[PDB]
Write a protein that binds this DNA or RNA. Structure first.
Ligand SMILES: [K+]
Ligand SMILES: [K+]
Ligand SMILES: [K+]
Ligand SMILES: [K+]
Ligand SMILES: [K+]
Ligand SMILES: [K+]
Ligand SMILES: [K+]
Ligand SMILES: [K+]
Ligand SMILES: [K+]
Ligand SMILES: [K+]
Ligand SMILES: [K+]
Ligand SMILES: [K+]
Ligand SMILES: [K+]
Ligand SMILES: [K+]
Ligand SMILES: [K+]
Ligand SMILES: [Mg+2]
Ligand SMILES: [Mg+2]
Ligand SMILES: [Mg+2]
Ligand SMILES: [Mg+2]
Ligand SMILES: [Mg+2]
Ligand SMILES: [Mg+2]
Ligand SMILES: [Mg+2]
Ligand SMILES: [Mg+2]
Ligand SMILES: [Mg+2]
Ligand SMILES: [Mg+2]
Ligand SMILES: [Mg+2]
Ligand SMILES: [Mg+2]
Ligand SMILES: [Mg+2]
Ligand SMILES: [Mg+2]
Ligand SMILES: [Mg+2]
Ligand SMILES: [Mg+2]
Ligand SMILES: [Mg+2]
Ligand SMILES: [Mg+2]
Ligand SMILES: [Mg+2]
Ligand SMILES: [Mg+2]
Ligand SMILES: [Mg+2]
Ligand SMILES: [Mg+2]
Ligand SMILES: [Mg+2]
Ligand SMILES: [Mg+2]
Ligand SMILES: [Mg+2]
Ligand SMILES: [Mg+2]
Ligand SMILES: [Mg+2]
Ligand SMILES: [Mg+2]
Ligand SMILES: [Mg+2]
Ligand SMILES: [Mg+2]
Ligand SMILES: [Mg+2]
Ligand SMILES: [Mg+2]
Ligand SMILES: [Mg+2]
Ligand SMILES: [Mg+2]
Ligand SMILES: [Mg+2]
Ligand SMILES: [Mg+2]
Ligand SMILES: [Mg+2]
Ligand SMILES: [Mg+2]
Ligand SMILES: [Mg+2]
Ligand SMILES: [Mg+2]
Ligand SMILES: [Mg+2]
Ligand SMILES: [Mg+2]
Ligand SMILES: [Mg+2]
Lengths: 101, 119, 73, 88
RNA sequence: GUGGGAGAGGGUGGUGGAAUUCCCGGAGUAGCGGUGAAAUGCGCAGAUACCGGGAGGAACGCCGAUGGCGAAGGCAGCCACCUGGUCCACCCGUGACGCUGAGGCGCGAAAGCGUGGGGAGCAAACCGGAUUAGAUACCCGGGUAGUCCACGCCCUAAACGAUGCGCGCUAGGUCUCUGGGUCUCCUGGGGGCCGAAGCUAACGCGUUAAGCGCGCCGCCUGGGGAGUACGGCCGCAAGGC
């Protein structure tokens, strides 16, 4: 088991209903990959520094899981399958390298 | 004729010639010019002067569409890039802004021999 | 020779490894979306090396730009 | 990779006495552990030559230590091998 | 051994944006390109310049360094997995288990070879345009192998620090990367520069020795003939030793 951080950027549109459907496939998929969600941060939709998928915004979802290394990649795959999923960046956790303080 | 009033002015500088393209707010050309449109046909198209004339030709032609103010966009380096920038400003057309947008790769295609061994 | 208060001075504490702090990272990019040298960042060899890795993460997430157009010329 | 526990279970499983960490028996056990795990990696990633050098080295050191036992205590030596599973 | 650290070290999968080319749509018109000057070339079957959509290949801007990693060749977008080396601290364990290393085995830039794939840009040969006294060149427009991937060969090089490996000893100064400390500074490992003594034909080298010493390997013995001939070994060949 190792600790990561799953980043996901979704279609900045979609009704309150669909948005929850993706989060349904996420959770579902997550578990299926030994995903122990130790945290989350649904930062919401934000204006991107550049258009991603033709749109000038995206809906950001941040987590913090612990799971079997041998599957991180697989999980990552499964996630990207959905269309409303435009970005998936899983970064191995790390202690904050404080600076200027 | 069609009446735009406000649009864009692209300046494509080259060590071989300069060419200007005026466009509607959506980037569709309305008129254009270049060292070749005006008299020049050899190595003079590159001249800062040729660029000047090309720039003024462009503006006037775009006056016929009743255009008044433009947003200048510059691309490339080239003897006579700046003359164009100036030729426009001093030509009825109100230059709202100037922006350099010369394309530069994050290193992808191997240059022709003539443009290698750089850096 | 690049003396206008290094970006580190005019700033407080911050996690150099936080790829989401746009408001802070944004500071290390120039007029263009280019990563400022050390003469401007003020950071150190080791710090700057982590800034880069961080920023490049931000960019991929769309939170930060790769390139900007220059307004003037 | 190789976690502390995995490592420990090995050191303890081979120590000559409690507290033994650097005895020829232990060392050779540890190496044999790395060697096996590494040879496994190279079965898949055949082109990873750089790592393979590391393997050549480990196999070296093991051989020289094992050679030492052979010379000092021909018994502990036949002991170790039979235990681990080396020499053919 | 335990606890920490840095890194473009290697392998596999994934993935991001910039640019080029091509295709599609829009808008728009007479040239564009290119040079010393030109022409070949491309464009009214509408090019160039501009906006939007798409496909594909290859390489990773800034950071970036006078920097880092590796035994060498060499290694640079970002993410995960697998994996090598290495440095410091603690003095905790073994107890000379060490150094070198003919032969062997493995690795080994580029080009090149084989089978299959891929092919955007670039480009031997080649087709053309210029230039010239000529121009089987330099310049310009094209362009096939190749460059890219896989698997297998080839084994070379200004494969260079033109400096074999290991260990001990011999002033300092200064910049730097990375670790520990009582953190002005001290201390360990790496990268630079100036230099004591000393060395050197000189140039220069100088705790990163080309100094003072020991151990082991490799190699040299005037130039041309010649890295040729012959033999042997290796290679599909080219060709290597
Ligand atoms: K800090
Ligand atoms: K290339
Ligand atoms: K013509
Ligand atoms: K052009
Ligand atoms: K360097
Ligand atoms: K060929
Ligand atoms: K290659
Ligand atoms: K080979
Ligand atoms: K310190
Ligand atoms: K002298
Ligand atoms: K000199
Ligand atoms: K000498
Ligand atoms: K022969
Ligand atoms: K053979
Ligand atoms: K043969
Ligand atoms: Mg011209
Ligand atoms: Mg350790
Ligand atoms: Mg360290
Ligand atoms: Mg550190
Ligand atoms: Mg690497
Ligand atoms: Mg078209
Ligand atoms: Mg014609
Ligand atoms: Mg016609
Ligand atoms: Mg046509
Ligand atoms: Mg049309
Ligand atoms: Mg075109
Ligand atoms: Mg386009
Ligand atoms: Mg492609
Ligand atoms: Mg194609
Ligand atoms: Mg080295
Ligand atoms: Mg080199
Ligand atoms: Mg390691
Ligand atoms: Mg002790
Ligand atoms: Mg004892
Ligand atoms: Mg040796
Ligand atoms: Mg080779
Ligand atoms: Mg090679
Ligand atoms: Mg090759
Ligand atoms: Mg081939
Ligand atoms: Mg082929
Ligand atoms: Mg083909
Ligand atoms: Mg070409
Ligand atoms: Mg050519
Ligand atoms: Mg063969
Ligand atoms: Mg060299
Ligand atoms: Mg001394
Ligand atoms: Mg000092
Ligand atoms: Mg230090
Ligand atoms: Mg030093
Ligand atoms: Mg260095
Ligand atoms: Mg002297
Ligand atoms: Mg000398
Ligand atoms: Mg002299
Ligand atoms: Mg010196
Ligand atoms: Mg010495
Ligand atoms: Mg010889
Ligand atoms: Mg002779
Ligand atoms: Mg030869």
């Amino acid at each position: 088991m190792r600790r990561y951080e799953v980043n996901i950027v979704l279609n900045p549109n979609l009704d309150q209903s669909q948005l929850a459907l993706e989060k349904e496939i996420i959770q579902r998929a997550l578990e299926n990959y030994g995903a122990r969600v130790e945290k989350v941060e649904e930062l919401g939709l934000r204006r991107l520094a550049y258009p991603i998928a033709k749109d000038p915004q995206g809906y950001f979802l941040w987590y913090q899981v612990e799971m079997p290394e041998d599957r991180v990649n697989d999980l990552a795959r499964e996630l990207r399958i959905r269309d409303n999923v435009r970005r998936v960046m899983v970064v191995k956790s790390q202690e904050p390298f404080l600076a200027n303080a | 004729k069609r009446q735009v009033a406000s649009g864009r002015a692209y300046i494509h500088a080259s060590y071989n010639n300069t060419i200007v393209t005026i466009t509607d707010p959506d980037g569709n050309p309305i008129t254009w010019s270049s060292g070749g449109v005006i008299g020049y046909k050899g190595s003079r198209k590159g001249t800062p002067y040729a660029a000047q004339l090309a720039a003024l030709d462009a503006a006037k032609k775009a006056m016929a569409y009743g255009m008044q103010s433009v947003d200048v966009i510059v691309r490339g380096t080239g003897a006579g890039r700046e003359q164009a920038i100036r030729a426009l400003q001093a030509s009825g057309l109100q230059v709202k802004s100037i922006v350099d947008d010369t394309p530069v790769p994050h290193n992808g295609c191997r240059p022709k021999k003539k443009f290698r061994k750089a850096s | 020779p690049s003396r206008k208060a290094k970006v580190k001075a005019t700033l407080g504490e911050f996690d150099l490894r936080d790829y989401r702090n746009v408001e802070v990272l944004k500071r290390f990019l120039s007029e263009t979306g280019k990563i400022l040298p050390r003469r401007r960042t003020g950071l150190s060899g080791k710090e700057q090396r982590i800034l880069a890795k961080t920023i490049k993460r931000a960019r991929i997430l769309g939170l930060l730009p790769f390139t900007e157009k220059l307004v003037r010329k | 990779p190789i976690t502390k526990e995995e490592k420990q279970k090995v050191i303890q499983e081979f120590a000559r006495f409690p507290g033994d960490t650097g005895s020829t028996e232990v060392q050779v056990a540890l190496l044999t552990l790395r060697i096996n795990r590494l040879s496994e990696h190279l079965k898949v990633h055949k082109k990873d030559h750089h790592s393979h050098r590391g393997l050549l080295m480990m196999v070296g050191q093991r051989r020289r230590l094992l050679r030492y036992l052979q010379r000092e205590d021909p018994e502990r030596y036949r002991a170790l091998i039979e235990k681990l599973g080396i020499r053919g």
